[PDB]
Amino acid sequence: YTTQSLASVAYLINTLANNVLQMLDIQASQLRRMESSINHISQTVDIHKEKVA
């Protein structure tokens, strides 16, 4: 029961950790794409304000 318990705990932790890392990796790349998208909007607003000027 000891061996079985050690193996089980290690497994469930390994699985949940891997999932958490995957979640953080996805959220990072989300912000990376969003910054790129915000930057292009900002450039577009800059261009527009200059045209009015």
Partner 1 sequence: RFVRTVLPFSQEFQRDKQPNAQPQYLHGSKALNLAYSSIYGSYRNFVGPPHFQVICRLLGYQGIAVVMEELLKVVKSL
Partner 2 sequence: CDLLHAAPFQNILPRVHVKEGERLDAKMKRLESKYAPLHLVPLIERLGTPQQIAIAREGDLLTKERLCCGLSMFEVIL
User: Which positions touch partner 2 (CB under 8 A)?
Assistant: 40, 43-44, 47, 50-51
Q: How far apart, in Å, are the Cα atoms of 17 and each of 3, 22, 38, 42?
A: 21, 9, 31, 37
Q: Which is nearer to partner 2, 3 or 49 (CB)?
A: 49
User: If contact means CB under 5 to 8 A according to the sort of partner, which of partner 1, partner 2, none does residue 52 touch?
Assistant: partner 1
Q: Which is nearer to partner 1, 1 or 50 (CB)?
A: 50
Site for partner 1 in 21-50 (CB under 8 A): 50
